[PDB]
Amino acid sequence: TAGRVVRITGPVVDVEFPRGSVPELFNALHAEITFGALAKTLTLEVAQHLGDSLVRCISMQPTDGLVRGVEVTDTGASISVPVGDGVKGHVFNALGDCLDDPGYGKDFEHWSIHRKPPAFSDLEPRTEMLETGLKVVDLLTPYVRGGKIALFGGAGVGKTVLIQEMINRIARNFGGTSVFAGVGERTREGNDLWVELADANVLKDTALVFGQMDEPPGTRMRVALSALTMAEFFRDEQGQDVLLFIDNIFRFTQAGSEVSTLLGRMPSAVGYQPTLADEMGELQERITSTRGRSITSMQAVYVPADDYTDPAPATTFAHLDATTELSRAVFSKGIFPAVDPLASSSTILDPAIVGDEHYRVAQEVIRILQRYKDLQDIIAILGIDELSEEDKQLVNRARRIERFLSQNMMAAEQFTGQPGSTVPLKETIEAFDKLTKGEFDHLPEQAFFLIGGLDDLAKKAESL
Amino acid sequence: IHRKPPAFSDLEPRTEMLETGLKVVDLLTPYVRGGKIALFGGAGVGKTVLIQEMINRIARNFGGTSVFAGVGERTREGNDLWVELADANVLKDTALVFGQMDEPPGTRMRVALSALTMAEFFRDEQGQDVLLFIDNIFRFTQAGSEVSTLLGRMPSAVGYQPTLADEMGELQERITSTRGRSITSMQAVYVPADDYTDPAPATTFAHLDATTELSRAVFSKGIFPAVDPLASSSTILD
Amino acid sequence: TVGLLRGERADEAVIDLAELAVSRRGEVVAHVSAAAELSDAQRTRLTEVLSRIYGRPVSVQLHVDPELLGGLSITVGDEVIDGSIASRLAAAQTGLP
Amino acid sequence: XXXXXXXXXXXEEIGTVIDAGDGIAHVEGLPSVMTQELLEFPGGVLGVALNLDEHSVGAVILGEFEKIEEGQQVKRTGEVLSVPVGDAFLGRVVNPLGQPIDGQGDIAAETRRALELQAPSVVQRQSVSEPLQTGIKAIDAMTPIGRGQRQLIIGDRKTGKTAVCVDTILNQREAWLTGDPKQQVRCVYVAIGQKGTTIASVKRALEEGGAMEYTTIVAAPASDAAGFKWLAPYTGSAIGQHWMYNGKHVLIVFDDLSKQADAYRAISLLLRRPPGREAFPGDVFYLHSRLLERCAKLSDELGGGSMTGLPIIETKANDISAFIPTNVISITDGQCFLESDLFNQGVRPAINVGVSVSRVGGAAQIKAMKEVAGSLRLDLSQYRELEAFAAFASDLDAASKAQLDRGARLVELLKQPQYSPLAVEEQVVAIFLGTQGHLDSVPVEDVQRFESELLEHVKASHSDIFDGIRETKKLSEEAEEKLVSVINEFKKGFQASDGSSVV
Amino acid sequence: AQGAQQIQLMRQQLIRQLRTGLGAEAVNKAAEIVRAHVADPQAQSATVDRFLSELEQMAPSSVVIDLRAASRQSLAALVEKFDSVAGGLDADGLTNLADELASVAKLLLSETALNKHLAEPTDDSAPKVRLLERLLSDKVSATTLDLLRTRWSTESNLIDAVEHTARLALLKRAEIEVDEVEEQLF
Amino acid sequence: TISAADIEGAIEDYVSSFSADTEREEIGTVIDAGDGIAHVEGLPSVMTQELLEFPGGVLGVALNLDEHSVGAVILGEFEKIEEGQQVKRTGEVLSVPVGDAFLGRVVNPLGQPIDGQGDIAAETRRALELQAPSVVQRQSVSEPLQTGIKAIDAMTPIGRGQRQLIIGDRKTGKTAVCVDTILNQREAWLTGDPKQQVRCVYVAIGQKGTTIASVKRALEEGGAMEYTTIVAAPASDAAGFKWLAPYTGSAIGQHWMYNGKHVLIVFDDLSKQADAYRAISLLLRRPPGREAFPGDVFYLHSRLLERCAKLSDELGGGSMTGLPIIETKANDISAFIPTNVISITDGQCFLESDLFNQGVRPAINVGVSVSRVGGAAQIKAMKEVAGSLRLDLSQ
Amino acid sequence: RAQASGEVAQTLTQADQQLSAQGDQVRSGLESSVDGLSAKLASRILGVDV
Ligand SMILES: Nc1ncnc2c1ncn2[C@@H]1O[C@H](COP(=O)(O)OP(=O)(O)OP(=O)(O)O)[C@@H](O)[C@H]1O
Ligand SMILES: Nc1ncnc2c1ncn2[C@@H]1O[C@H](COP(=O)(O)OP(=O)(O)OP(=O)(O)O)[C@@H](O)[C@H]1O
Ligand SMILES: Nc1ncnc2c1ncn2[C@@H]1O[C@H](COP(=O)(O)OP(=O)(O)O)[C@@H](O)[C@H]1O
Ligand SMILES: [Mg+2]
Ligand SMILES: [Mg+2]
Numbered sequence A: 001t002a003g004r005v006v007r008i009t010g011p012v013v014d015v016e017f018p019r020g021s022v023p024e025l026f027n028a029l030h031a032e033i034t035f036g037a038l039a040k041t042l043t044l045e046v047a048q049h050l051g052d053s054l055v056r057c058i059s060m061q062p063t064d065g066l067v068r069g070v071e072v073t074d075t076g077a078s079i080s081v082p083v084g085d086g087v088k089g090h091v092f093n094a095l096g097d098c099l100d101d102p103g104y105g106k107d108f109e110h111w112s113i114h115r116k117p118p119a120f121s122d123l124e125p126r127t128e129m130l131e132t133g134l135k136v137v138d139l140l141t142p143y144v145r146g147g148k149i150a151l152f153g154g155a156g157v158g159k160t161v162l163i164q165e166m167i168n169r170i171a172r173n174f175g176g177t178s179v180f181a182g183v184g185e186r187t188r189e190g191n192d193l194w195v196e197l198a199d200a201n202v203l204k205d206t207a208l209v210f211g212q213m214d215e216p217p218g219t220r221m222r223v224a225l226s227a228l229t230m231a232e233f234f235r236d237e238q239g240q241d242v243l244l245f246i247d248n249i250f251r252f253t254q255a256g257s258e259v260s261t262l263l264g265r266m267p268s269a270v271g272y273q274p275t276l277a278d279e280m281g282e283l284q285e286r287i288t289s290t291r292g293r294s295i296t297s298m299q300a301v302y303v304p305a306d307d308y309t310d311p312a313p314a315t316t317f318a319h320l321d322a323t324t325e326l327s328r329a330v331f332s333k334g335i336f337p338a339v340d341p342l343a344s345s346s347t348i349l350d351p352a353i354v355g356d357e358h359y360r361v362a363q364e365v366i367r368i369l370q371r372y373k374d375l376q377d378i379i380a381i382l383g384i385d386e387l388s389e390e391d392k393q394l395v396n397r398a399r400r401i402e403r404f405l406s407q408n409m410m411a412a413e414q415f416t417g418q419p420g421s422t423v424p425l426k427e428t429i430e431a432f433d434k435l436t437k438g439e440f441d442h443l444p445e446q447a448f449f450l451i452g453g454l455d456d457l458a459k460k461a462e463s464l
Numbered sequence B: 001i002h003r004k005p006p007a008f009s010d011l012e013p014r015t016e017m018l019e020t021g022l023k024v025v026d027l028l029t030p031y032v033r034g035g036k037i038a039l040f041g042g043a044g045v046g047k048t049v050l051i052q053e054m055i056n057r058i059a060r061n062f063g064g065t066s067v068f069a070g071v072g073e074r075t076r077e078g079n080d081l082w083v084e085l086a087d088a089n090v091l092k093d094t095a096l097v098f099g100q101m102d103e104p105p106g107t108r109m110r111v112a113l114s115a116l117t118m119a120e121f122f123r124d125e126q127g128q129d130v131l132l133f134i135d136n137i138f139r140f141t142q143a144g145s146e147v148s149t150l151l152g153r154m155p156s157a158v159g160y161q162p163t164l165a166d167e168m169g170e171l172q173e174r175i176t177s178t179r180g181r182s183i184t185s186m187q188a189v190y191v192p193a194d195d196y197t198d199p200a201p202a203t204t205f206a207h208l209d210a211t212t213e214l215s216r217a218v219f220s221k222g223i224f225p226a227v228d229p230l231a232s233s234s235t236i237l238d
Numbered sequence C: 001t002v003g004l005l006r007g008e009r010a011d012e013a014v015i016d017l018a019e020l021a022v023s024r025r026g027e028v029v030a031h032v033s034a035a036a037e038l039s040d041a042q043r044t045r046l047t048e049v050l051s052r053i054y055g056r057p058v059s060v061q062l063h064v065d066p067e068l069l070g071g072l073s074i075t076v077g078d079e080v081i082d083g084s085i086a087s088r089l090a091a092a093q094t095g096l097p
Numbered sequence D: 001x002x003x004x005x006x007x008x009x010x011x012e013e014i015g016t017v018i019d020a021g022d023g024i025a026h027v028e029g030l031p032s033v034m035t036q037e038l039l040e041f042p043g044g045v046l047g048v049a050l051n052l053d054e055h056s057v058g059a060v061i062l063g064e065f066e067k068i069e070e071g072q073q074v075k076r077t078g079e080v081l082s083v084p085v086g087d088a089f090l091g092r093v094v095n096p097l098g099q100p101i102d103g104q105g106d107i108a109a110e111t112r113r114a115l116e117l118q119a120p121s122v123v124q125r126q127s128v129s130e131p132l133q134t135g136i137k138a139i140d141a142m143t144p145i146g147r148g149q150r151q152l153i154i155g156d157r158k159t160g161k162t163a164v165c166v167d168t169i170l171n172q173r174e175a176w177l178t179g180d181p182k183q184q185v186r187c188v189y190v191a192i193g194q195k196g197t198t199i200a201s202v203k204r205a206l207e208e209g210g211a212m213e214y215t216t217i218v219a220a221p222a223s224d225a226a227g228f229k230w231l232a233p234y235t236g237s238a239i240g241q242h243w244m245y246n247g248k249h250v251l252i253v254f255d256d257l258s259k260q261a262d263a264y265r266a267i268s269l270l271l272r273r274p275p276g277r278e279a280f281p282g283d284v285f286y287l288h289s290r291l292l293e294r295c296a297k298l299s300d301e302l303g304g305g306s307m308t309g310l311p312i313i314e315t316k317a318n319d320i321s322a323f324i325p326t327n328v329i330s331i332t333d334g335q336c337f338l339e340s341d342l343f344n345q346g347v348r349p350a351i352n353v354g355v356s357v358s359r360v361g362g363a364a365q366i367k368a369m370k371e372v373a374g375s376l377r378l379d380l381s382q383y384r385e386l387e388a389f390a391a392f393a394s395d396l397d398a399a400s401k402a403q404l405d406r407g408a409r410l411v412e413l414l415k416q417p418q419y420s421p422l423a424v425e426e427q428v429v430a431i432f433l434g435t436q437g438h439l440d441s442v443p444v445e446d447v448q449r450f451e452s453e454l455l456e457h458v459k460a461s462h463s464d465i466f467d468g469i470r471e472t473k474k475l476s477e478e479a480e481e482k483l484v485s486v487i488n489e490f491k492k493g494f495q496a497s498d499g500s501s502v503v
Numbered sequence E: 001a002q003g004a005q006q007i008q009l010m011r012q013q014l015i016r017q018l019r020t021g022l023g024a025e026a027v028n029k030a031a032e033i034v035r036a037h038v039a040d041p042q043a044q045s046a047t048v049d050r051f052l053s054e055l056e057q058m059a060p061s062s063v064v065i066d067l068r069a070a071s072r073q074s075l076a077a078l079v080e081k082f083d084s085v086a087g088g089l090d091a092d093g094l095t096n097l098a099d100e101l102a103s104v105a106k107l108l109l110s111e112t113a114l115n116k117h118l119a120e121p122t123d124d125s126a127p128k129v130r131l132l133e134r135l136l137s138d139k140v141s142a143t144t145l146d147l148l149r150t151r152w153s154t155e156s157n158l159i160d161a162v163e164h165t166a167r168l169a170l171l172k173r174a175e176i177e178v179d180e181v182e183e184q185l186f
Numbered sequence F: 001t002i003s004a005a006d007i008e009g010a011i012e013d014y015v016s017s018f019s020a021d022t023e024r025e026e027i028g029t030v031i032d033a034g035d036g037i038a039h040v041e042g043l044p045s046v047m048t049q050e051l052l053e054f055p056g057g058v059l060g061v062a063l064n065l066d067e068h069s070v071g072a073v074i075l076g077e078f079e080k081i082e083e084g085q086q087v088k089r090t091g092e093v094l095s096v097p098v099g100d101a102f103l104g105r106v107v108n109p110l111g112q113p114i115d116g117q118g119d120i121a122a123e124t125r126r127a128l129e130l131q132a133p134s135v136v137q138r139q140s141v142s143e144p145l146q147t148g149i150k151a152i153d154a155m156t157p158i159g160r161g162q163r164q165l166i167i168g169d170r171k172t173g174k175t176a177v178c179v180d181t182i183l184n185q186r187e188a189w190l191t192g193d194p195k196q197q198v199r200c201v202y203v204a205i206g207q208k209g210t211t212i213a214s215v216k217r218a219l220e221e222g223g224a225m226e227y228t229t230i231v232a233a234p235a236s237d238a239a240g241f242k243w244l245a246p247y248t249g250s251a252i253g254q255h256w257m258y259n260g261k262h263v264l265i266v267f268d269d270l271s272k273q274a275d276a277y278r279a280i281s282l283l284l285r286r287p288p289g290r291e292a293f294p295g296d297v298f299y300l301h302s303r304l305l306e307r308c309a310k311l312s313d314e315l316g317g318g319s320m321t322g323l324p325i326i327e328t329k330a331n332d333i334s335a336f337i338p339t340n341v342i343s344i345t346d347g348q349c350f351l352e353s354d355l356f357n358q359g360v361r362p363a364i365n366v367g368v369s370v371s372r373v374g375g376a377a378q379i380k381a382m383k384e385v386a387g388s389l390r391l392d393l394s395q
Numbered sequence G: 001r002a003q004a005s006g007e008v009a010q011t012l013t014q015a016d017q018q019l020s021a022q023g024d025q026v027r028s029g030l031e032s033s034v035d036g037l038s039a040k041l042a043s044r045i046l047g048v049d050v
């Protein structure tokens, strides 16, 4: 005995079941579409109970071709993804289907994507700094080994460049095992990544799960859970340390809104779903470094219309330990990676963790840039000349500090042709201390763009 | 609690100035004895202090009677007022009614009308002039808006009940001083989001002879009592 | 009844028909569950008890099930007696410090 | 026993419209209809069955909804939302339903393809490593477009977007005349919300240039119902995909994609779905991405075909930070922002060299152009800032002045007239003239003439330059020396509109 | 001092761990002992008897109750009119009235507008009675029309009342076997 | 050392004490479930805001009582719920366990432990919606809550029985200030005098687990967990816990308060409570008011904060001091929820990032910040040396 | 500070191992009592001296 479809509205499908055989929430159901070249087996996920033995489900595939009255069979379990050391090296989708080898993973151990987060008693905060080799990050927003990092920004400001750069900075040398969740990003980038990780030979040590934009919202929101399951398996069972890249996690909340509008739930503010914070929290709290093991996560967050006050970014800000924030304005200045020094933040930027020499320089730089950002309102009208000398001396080196935060990243080599640069922390501290104290105030601003370290600064200045 | 306001036949305008001893008030926003006076202000600029100062300055010299309506105000300042009035002798002649914000919408709506019923008794049945203080009369329409969507009214503009104008008028028109029997009303008004355009202040402004409009911009400069000299206005400044 | 169901569920409809039949008989009906059928004397005693727990006399329909390994459970109106020993095992398990 | 009784009890469909309003209808019956099935009504009107309720079916009406009324019979077509497709569409103007609107005749369709067919997955695709020559100097030099790329043409009202895309379509004729499908690009021009006269003008321009041998137009003019505007991009991509999976190369222009957003806003609000930002429904992203992800280059295991997309977006007062602009910028692989403040001065096409980017980059640029032009972008950006500075410099060093004049002459070089696409073999020379400094002696006011004449000089004599470039896609020294000799020989024969010779 | 406090904390946690382990094994073994005891109906019936004694000890009835008041009163008036009709009726005439009431129920559900009009309760119901009679006297037995000559709040309940009267009539015909009908219905 | 006698005695005492009342009680059935909401049929005798008991041990609050259904918010894991299953009534209006055994624990909003250190020997149960003390029962704030922060204790003092909103933007020093205020109380706690030692409650709403743990161990570093309780409604938990945590915190506080103790309550942060209440109300399909917030979002905070005050000597003289935190999107104070809390509380400490970034730390904007009880909550000496510092710095 | 922290760590570890051994000692004794306690609990559940 099994159920029947009785309503269809986009990817959302209502199914009626016998009186006593209603499926539990988040159970997976199978249905058939038999029109033609469009035919396929649909997986539906139970999202609600509507009463009278009727339940409302989210389709993981496009419903096109689904006719009313077709039978629907309950699997009795949630959507299950393959887990195991054999997962590494291959590409998967949200439903556990391998794309590189269709039959792969059918015989592996299967874990449910829906799981409760770790007990509070097993949580412990991390403080060990992670050295990436980017000046602005390592100085003002030091990442945490085993913490949660995020890259915010609008459209067309450097999510992908900086994300693959950080892949080169961490994953290229990380001794552990990596997972890459592509949540609603463009597919061409996924193919580029699948090729690049093989060129660099890193592929054999990382797993990829993709849910790109073309897919309907129902799976577009579950892809994150699908990959997080493999990440937390590598965490809890194998005991390895893990890197969990996710791009872009805003599309998870966007798919949540799309499915919400169909489920019939009333809209919140500007038009997101209610429980937005609850879904995002249920997702993010699972990505945590429990005692004795670690899962380092770098997330990308989209920001529509550059409205940093949009409820979704404003919500996701709460779950992150490090938050690099890109900006349109800094990008227009030609600065790259275009990080906003005053908006970005990191919780471990305190003297007890990073040391006094680092903290003092970071805070002096922040003070200089803040005074600059306050004088901008006059700078824009009357130019620098109107300012008093205590302000003009400050602005002259503020511009230089700002431009020196730029760096010639390895990823940009494919566009600019200039090779990449990695700098150690101590050299960055020395350089910015010298800058704030004025040992380089005599050089022109254009000398500072996209340098790298200090020796490269001298080499470039000599040529001008 | 509920009674229709006095007929238009019995109303006359008031033109006797009330001296308070506040430089800005006495100069730019002269008050009217027997009129309707209001303080306006966003959150935190000090309305509750200024209204207690008006109690200190008027009700001390005032030989008549007085009533204080706590409409959705915070309780600590009501207790401070109850203790202060008993430290002086004024309490012998001052009635107090409290419907503070710890209570649900019903009491926040009807407490104003109850204190106003007491004031109307003093006005009509005795003729002894009286001072009616209300703090804060925005919580009345606020509670109305809170209950609106549950009663079945469709929400209007930024989110007040549609009956706002008439629901507020049925109250305000009762505080009037009919001829030969005065009520001096002093009511504090909250301005949401410091938005003087919000429908509630915009509707309240019409029922008042003098408005001592506080502003956060002045308060941040340390100017205290922080009255905005430009926005504040009075009809007796002729 | 089937000719005029007008939207109700068949099972609930027939059960309401039975409830009407018994009410018109002047009694009420309770649903009883236990691991084994009680004896005739036991049923007469059960009726004698329910006639003291409720005013008008209560008739009974027995839904035997091995879940209630011991004892019996009674449902009437929308009130219930949780007398089964399995509920006692569940309680002792959950009540543990 | 129960089973047999149940079977005994259990022992061409036509529906009826119960409700109709403003481009949407509700239909009774049709128990066996598929979701998004193309229903048909008595008036010769079609519909899309979006919502299937327990008692009625919601159908968005395509075309003249005026002809629908309560009590009309509705019948199944038996086809999921689909359009006819084939090679026969080449040279025809069709409405989103695949029906001919030009009155030129019937369509000898090959087959039918559904619109909701999913894009090719990560494993099926290939890198964008193949040049889609646009013929605009300001684009092929600095922002090259590869086959399988999505290049946004975002700009302001009246800034030459449609002109640029028509030039891109016209440039492909030099390739069409070769029979090999690997070069033989074919095109589709999807017109959404454009004026009928503008579509007619595009039709005429393409006919005059010979582009209609290989271009298909899908017309959803402003007069028609929102549903046509909503479908036009999807039916255009459906026409393209059939060629794409067969191993052809396709170029899709969407002019303009913001009005599909507006049409879907209308449709959604008529269905009473709760709107989001800018009153748009929450799923406009799944509209534009569902459309643009279809564009790809396929792996050779699937046919080496590709489809290139050039979506146009109209920006309110150059506010590139708006909702739909940022949504499409987040989907496409680059943008060529056409600034109006430059268009009115005469910089045409008005490509903003600072904001424009090609996120594929020089991978799809031929080696000749890659060497000659690859420096131009940053040089022009620094020239623009140098000009912004020197605009109020009472005096400045000679080096700044020389860089300023070089920049001004490069800017004057980049612009070109409408409907005048230049082959890459000529674009490389046109940019060589500037980057290598041979223009350093010609007055600005003549530069645009100078280049346009020299390309004809090299066209009549010393053809081995263009041929050597074309046949190897790199500019060899044995040709560069003859090029420089021809340039210096021409400089003596050329003359300005006023003043002296050009040395 | 904080270190020593943590020592004491770990000691308490150890006490808790052994305590919970003991309790869990205790309850599991008690479940085993219970299921071992409950293996024959001699235990089942005895346990039911013990529960019966405990329920005899239970407090006496304390709830009188064990779609709205106006509709309920209309249903009770229908019940009284049926009491009169049945006092007059017999099993054969009872079945005739039941069939007539089932037919009139089918009519009322077919002609929805009539139910929507008639179901509105008002004083001066006599003209409504005449409207009813003009059709009830033709296709319905005199007794069915006499009972039908009877205030309900909604058309759904007014229609259900006809089925109610028909059930009452057929059950009374059965009574003229109450236990048999009840048992077969269950 | 550990002994067998204690373990054996506890196990045997439970075993011998075990008994079941076998009481008759009312039953209902779930007809709808989803997003943390459940519609239950039956339960005629159910009280408004009664605790319903679902079969997986999960609890719920009956907020809506319709003519044919009861609307309940599930306070726990809603995944286990199924349509058609049984639901019991508890016979208890929404209440939480309270007792001085909560000191040092971390508890779910329902008052059950999540620190893992075992069950809590609760003293009694207290309803979460008891009425605030009236104008007559209260007393004038006249004694200081020493924060140890110069910019506050001198310029904008906090007194016992005072409400001082801490209103800032992201990463400005809200949690820092409140944690420091809790830490500074040890020098008074160690005196053992109940009339000056301050007991603390840190309510975490919407905080991520590792942040709650960092706060916990920062308090342990300073010995604050000897007198501090933590009510943790982490991000993962359903909107119900997130909406409820402030009220259970206030109840745990009010018990000590009315027993004659002095209490301090930090809410971190009430904007998350407003968001959770919005979510719950929208799932129950109440028509929202301005900015999609529930119509009565003000009454959510007012009856939470007004319930902290100083009692008169006739009720033991105890007090409860609140320090609610508000997070302001894009550093505008003139918004809906911040301007509500500003009007419910007695004073504002406004933390501005543009001051934090220029060395002024804690980043108290001296102009907007105020303490309306003021110098009455200060020792004489500070009133002398700091009597006008706020106005002078604003000028 | 360092000296006191080292002493604290030593105390913690020594107590850890001692408590492990002591718990191992006592739980063996508890294994004997558990069965009688279970019989008592079963007697409570059934309502008779099982
Ligand atoms: N290459 C060119 N050089 C100079 N001017 C041009 C060129 N192309 C177009 N224009 C100008 O722009 C007009 C046509 O522009 P076009 O139709 O491309 O604008 P558009 O971006 O399509 O605006 P809309 O979308 O509103 O039609 C021409 O009539 C001409 O004035
Ligand atoms: N008084 C101070 N002096 C110097 N640094 C400080 C001070 N107070 C806080 N900080 C630092 O600034 C950062 C502030 O983070 P904080 O703990 O205040 O987050 P928050 O304000 O609680 O934000 P959220 O409410 O979102 O957690 C921390 O890294 C902390 O070390
Ligand atoms: N250092 C740099 N130099 C030059 N261009 C850069 C640099 N960093 C990033 N970019 C450009 O920015 C673009 C980033 O796009 P992307 O981050 O993918 O946007 P989104 O993620 O919003 O789609 C790239 O195409 C790249 O060309
Ligand atoms: Mg990206
Ligand atoms: Mg155009």
Ligand SMILES: [Mg+2]
Pocket (backbone or CB within 6 Å): F174, F175, F268
């Ligand atoms: Mg905080």
